[PDB]
Design a protein around this ligand. Sequence first.
Ligand code: GDP
Ligand code: GDP
Lengths: 81, 420, 420
Amino acid sequence: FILLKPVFHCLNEILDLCHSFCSLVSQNLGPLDERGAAQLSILVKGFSRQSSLLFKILSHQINSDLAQLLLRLDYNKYYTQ
Amino acid sequence: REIITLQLGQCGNQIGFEFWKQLCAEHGISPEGIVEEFATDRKDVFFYQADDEHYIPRAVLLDLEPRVIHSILNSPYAKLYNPENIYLGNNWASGFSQGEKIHEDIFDIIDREADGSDSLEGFVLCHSIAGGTGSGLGSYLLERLNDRYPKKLVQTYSVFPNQDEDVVVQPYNSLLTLKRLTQNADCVVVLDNTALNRIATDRLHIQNPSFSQINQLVSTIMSASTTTLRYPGYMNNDLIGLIASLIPTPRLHFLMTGYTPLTTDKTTVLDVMRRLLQPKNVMVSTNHCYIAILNIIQGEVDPTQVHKSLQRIRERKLANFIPWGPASIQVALSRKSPYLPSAHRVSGLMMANHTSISSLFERTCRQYDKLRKREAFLEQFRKEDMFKDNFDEMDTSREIVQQLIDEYHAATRPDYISWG
Amino acid sequence: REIITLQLGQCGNQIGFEFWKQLCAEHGISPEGIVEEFATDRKDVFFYQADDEHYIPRAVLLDLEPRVIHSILNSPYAKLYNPENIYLGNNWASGFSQGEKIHEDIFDIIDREADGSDSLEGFVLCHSIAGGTGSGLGSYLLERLNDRYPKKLVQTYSVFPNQDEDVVVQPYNSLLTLKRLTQNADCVVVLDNTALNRIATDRLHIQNPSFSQINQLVSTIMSASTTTLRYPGYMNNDLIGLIASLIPTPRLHFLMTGYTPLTTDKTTVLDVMRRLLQPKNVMVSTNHCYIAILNIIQGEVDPTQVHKSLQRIRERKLANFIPWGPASIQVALSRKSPYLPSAHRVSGLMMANHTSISSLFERTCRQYDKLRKREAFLEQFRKEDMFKDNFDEMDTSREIVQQLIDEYHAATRPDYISWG
Ligand SMILES: Nc1nc2c(ncn2[C@@H]2O[C@H](COP(=O)(O)OP(=O)(O)O)[C@@H](O)[C@H]2O)c(=O)[nH]1
Ligand SMILES: Nc1nc2c(ncn2[C@@H]2O[C@H](COP(=O)(O)OP(=O)(O)O)[C@@H](O)[C@H]2O)c(=O)[nH]1
């Protein structure tokens, strides 16, 4: 799906924001509310908005692209929300 | 990093002896550890590399009151396993005390291998629960390893013992082992003597020599559980990467087993999956539900159908689960090896987190609770009383395992988001 | 310059008999001493050239009260070694005293050969430590040679004796030999009876006839240690260049031995080099570290492999060492001979300065210290008491060897720049 810009210019961000979260947790084993919480919760909400947006886009009708949805639709976790 | 297997106790030493032998023939290794002339696999993790192609596995063999450790030595494969690291009661307390005096020399044998390897990722124990010497010594060694290697992780191929219920203290010994296993083991893979004995009665007429034949059954599962690591692939190219999906909450780290061609001695992926979810293929004996499921297939498997197989298995819904965990089943593939027979060209295994295994834990807790009231077998052996005058570790174990029994059923409930 | 080997004592005479026989077949030589017809190598150093191509080894055979000595004389090779130079207790003192009365005739036999040769570079002794007659006589002859022939460089193929600890005075005899060896040897190559006996048990089932079979093992190492000198090369042709790298400080002149083919009866250099760094191939029985390592490989080796090989052993780090000396392992290559079999045509050996050998010295010093307090075996034989009434050479030896034990461990430390 590298060819189509929207799926590519949104999934890349799903990974880049995750790198930043992975860095915040990487910073300390001691609990961190030093502005981490402010962005960590912005992040939980931010990742749900984009993660559901591409769930909606996912749902040539390639068997691979459509069938992939059902691993997530086993719980219908994003759609149910 | 290379995996070091701490096989201990007569029963545990029997299934490590066979598991290494199973990977001897499966891999390109002879009984003297020499590269086979007849011979594409990642042998680095399981087999240490000697210069003249002596593929000696990193096995740590611990013997206590030895009998079957002497028979292991008089074998054609004695040369194959030569890290030259073997060091000299039926009570859990009797095993724990014996381990404590020899802890430093057995622990130096652990160090030697850790220093020798480029790296060490996990300690895989061929543990025997209520194993007489095997339990107690195994619980103690389980406690020392985590403290020394806080970053490292420990797995347990626990052969949980169910023989229709001889050991009169069997429930007491098992009760103590789990308490250590629940707080001091990163992962555990559960097996059952009765479940396999029932399979042995099913596939074969073998009944009286249940232990010798069932060894092969435990082995096929053991070799198979690691084949994705022992042979290279797209995903699960390291133990830890695979472990995460199977255990979603730390307390619930017990894993159920199954094998599609129990009689492995063409088949489409759609078929080998459905067969596995059926309960005859399972080897373990209020709503109940799986937490996550995983499957690995090694054979002539078409690729275009494997995703269609996951979809087809989704329509059948042969596997019922509505747990707190969001983990859905995934279709994994591993490389069937050449040289050895290719019978059942397609053949599979499944490792799953299931709340049914809670019932097996409660049955030994039931035998123990009944036994505790009677105090019929307190042993009161001076070792048992002097080691445990209060007898309160058994009660500490009883609350910890009851928390586990409770946590499991909490998993079944809709709110494991709240504390379990 | 030609090398003269002073083989002495029954044990020493046994390994010189075989070493010369080993170079008889390996070189173009016959039992008569004449060259074989079927027969590009440098035979000048080890073999004297007679007018009719009777290449006679420059062997000096010393015997004391000979009875089994006559067995060397009743051999097909009696003609091969005919410099016509053989001249007639189990105590170190008993051997030293016997040597002193016959010192001048044995010393004239040394002179004859020195005069006969174009030149003489070193005296290589097939010495036996705690060898009954072999020790004591060997220490005394070690002291005379340096004074008379200071310019030459001495080596000792010491067969340090470890048989699991019969000689009840064995530690006392050995203690005295080392004080002399440390003081009066330019080099020493250490071998161990137990280490080789353990190898014999490993490669073969031979246990009871350990001495006869182990002779072949000591021989393969001995022929091999000088193969670069015996055969033409672009470097280290002289004995001295070879010796300098192996001994970086004068006191630490003891060298460990190993053979890549534990069983020599294709293989890339990257492999043959790795075998030397495995302890199963080593033949010798607080941080510890090598001081400098060297290796010599034999046969038509592929060379490009070595750059890959040398950089390859480096990543492997199978050899751990960080001494005061720089300690890069040194790579040498030689030609396997054109008479003997090409089976295992590639075969290697390693000579290294290792601080572990200090431990073997301390074990005899431990037996002696325990024995000294008891005074269980002071011998008090009139020879022993009259030769040593003070018994203070043993204490002089104890401080000198303790200085050596101390110096070694100082080598392990970061500051051997300061006095050791
Ligand atoms: N799976 C399996 N379990 C065994 C075998 N032999 C013994 N066991 C188990 O080992 C446990 C008892 O350990 P035991 O053999 O008494 O150890 P010991 O004290 O060293 O003899 C029992 O719970 C048995 O189920 C075997 O061959 N296979
Ligand atoms: N390597 C080797 N050592 C031997 C052999 N025979 C004897 N020895 C060693 O010789 C030492 C004793 O020397 P001994 O034979 O008493 O000398 P003797 O006083 O002339 O008899 C012991 O430490 C033995 O280890 C042999 O065939 N090979």
